[PDB]
Structure formats: structure tokens, C-alpha cells
Point group: none
Chain length 81, copies 5
Amino acid sequence: MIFEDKFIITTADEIPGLQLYSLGIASTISDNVDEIVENLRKQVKAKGGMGLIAFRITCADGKFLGYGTIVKADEAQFTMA
Amino acid sequence: MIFEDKFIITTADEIPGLQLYSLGIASTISDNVDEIVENLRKQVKAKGGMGLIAFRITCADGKFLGYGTIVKADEAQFTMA
Amino acid sequence: MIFEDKFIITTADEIPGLQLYSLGIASTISDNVDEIVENLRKQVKAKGGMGLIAFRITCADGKFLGYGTIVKADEAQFTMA
Amino acid sequence: MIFEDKFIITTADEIPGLQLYSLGIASTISDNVDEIVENLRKQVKAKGGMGLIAFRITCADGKFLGYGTIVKADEAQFTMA
Amino acid sequence: MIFEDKFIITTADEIPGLQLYSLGIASTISDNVDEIVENLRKQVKAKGGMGLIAFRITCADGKFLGYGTIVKADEAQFTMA
């Protein structure tokens, strides 16, 4: 219970010192940040991502697509691939 | 000696030269900058945060939460132990 | 060192370590994220760009839309002649 | 006497190379950008600031607002020792 | 005369490595991106600027607000005193 369990979420940051690799873009429309974040977490967690960068929700009119990009750092120790 | 800052509010991207650590996301809806800022300052410090980054107010000219990530930097204790 | 792959899309406009060259600006409006990405792809793939930076979407009838700056790395195959 | 910069205005950036210190946030409701800039300028120079950062200001529609943060740069920090 | 690059358009993307000088701010209200860009380019090059920062688009088929900061690189460096 320690590997593949560290989920981080930052907004308007860069987390310098880490090499991030693009794993695609995630988007989900819904209400309550807990459901949006919880739904995104399961995406990286299940895709082996690390978290979401620039998690800006900023709604306008019913549009709650928490746009975020999934990133991953080398040295996964999960699968040599 | 006695510094000064307590709650820092900046409008940009981040504060370089300091190690910022995210301990959660903050979100609030309301009017008046005094109540919006105080609402976050209370939610930010209540969780141990010391400043807010990217202070927004309105953009879609209607429904819009300021949205802000809570962050904090270590004082001198090493995370090793 | 991991080099570039094919089409990359991030939300932060950075990717340090690479020389980005402006090839202009792209803009598209539609009610489909997969169609917008594909529509822009044909626009970038046709311009030999690298990918889309800061790609956001949020509109119902015809309000906001998708937008981004095109970028390319290496020589622009154009200097004088 | 001897004045080249002093007043500096950037649209969403950070002006790297300069130490900026926040001494409060400025906000004013009005129409016409000429009056907004002049209104903040008088508020910024009146406080002995340097200029204004983050000039996003959304388009007009019925009740928008151009919020901004006041900043100032100077040799060393606050002495008053 | 090695500057080569002169007119550059960037959307939500800083340009480190270049010394930018503020020459004021531009603003455009109307529809049609071709008229907005042409209005800024003519306003930027007419003042002998370098390029424009910001941009973005919103509310198509209608009026919005196209603005940006006018910058210019020519302050040169400084002698190592």
C-alpha cells in the first residue's frame, strides 16, 4: 500500500524537479468537485497516471468540464514495459 | 525579526524561490471581494495554507467561482524524518 | 532521453528543452471535442506543427470556442528564398 | 527627473527579472478602458506602486469588472529597523 | 541585425530569452477574427512594436474584446559593474 497511490492535483503550477509525460487529456461534466476529482482520479489511477495539472474548472453555464491533462514520470517501477 | 504577510494574495501563476506544496483545492461562490477573499483566507489558513495563487473573480460575466489551490512551504524540518 | 512522438496536446504551454516556432493561430467551433481535435489536427498536420497548447472548450449555441497557437521545432524550411 | 519605465502594465504575464511585492489589491467598476486604466494608474501611483499586473478584464456585457493586484519593486525589502 | 524575428503572436505562452519593453496596451471590439488581428497588427507595427501577448477569442458571430500588451526588445543588456 504505497506504490501507485500518490495522487496530486495542482492548479496554475508546474511542480519543477519532475519530468512529466503526456498521457492524453481527461474531461468530465458533473456537479460537486468531489465527483469531478474522484472521477478524474480513477482515470489516472486506472491509466497509471500521476495526477492532473492545471485543474481549472471555471464554469460558464452548465459546463463543468474539469479540463486537465494526465502526466506520468519515468521510473514507474510498476512495469518495465 | 517580526516579518509581515500572514495571508498573501497574488494574481499571476506562482511564487518562484519558494517550495509550494498543495494540500487540497479551495472553491467558494459569493459577491464582494471582501467576503470572497475572507472566505478563502479562512478556508486556506484553516487547512494550514499561508497564501493564495491566481485570485480570479468573474470571467463569464455571470456564474464563476474564484477557485484557488491551497499551498504551503516547509519551514526547515526535512521530510526525510 | 525520451524524444518527441507524434501529436502532443498539453494545458500549460511550456515543454521546456524544445525550440518552439510560431506558425500562426488556429481557431475552430463545433459541438464535439473529438471532432475539434481532429479538425485542428488536419489544420496542424497540414501546417507541420507540433501540437495544441492550452486547448479549452465550453459553448452550447455559439458562445466561446476552441483556440490555441500553433508551434513547430527545427528549421522552418524558410529563410530567404 | 530621469524616468523611462516606472509605470509598467502587462496583460497576464509575470515580468521576470523584477522583484514584485504586493501591498494590496485594487478593483474599480466602470465602462471604457481609458477610464479604467486611468483610474487604476491614479490608484497605483498614489500608493507609490510600480504598475499593474494581469490586465485580462473580460469584455463588457452588463456588469463586468477589471480586478488587478498592486505591486512595487525596490532595493532590499522593508527595513524600518 | 541578428534579431531576424520581428512580428510574433503568442496566446497564453511567455517568451523567456527576450527582453520585452511595454509600449502600452491595445484593445479591439467587433466580430471577425481577421479584422481583430489585422487591427492589432496594424496598431502594433504602426508603433514599431515587436509582437502582441494574450489574444484568445470568445463569443463568435458577435462582439467581444481583442486586446494585448505591446512589447518591444531593444533595452540591450548592461555592463557587469
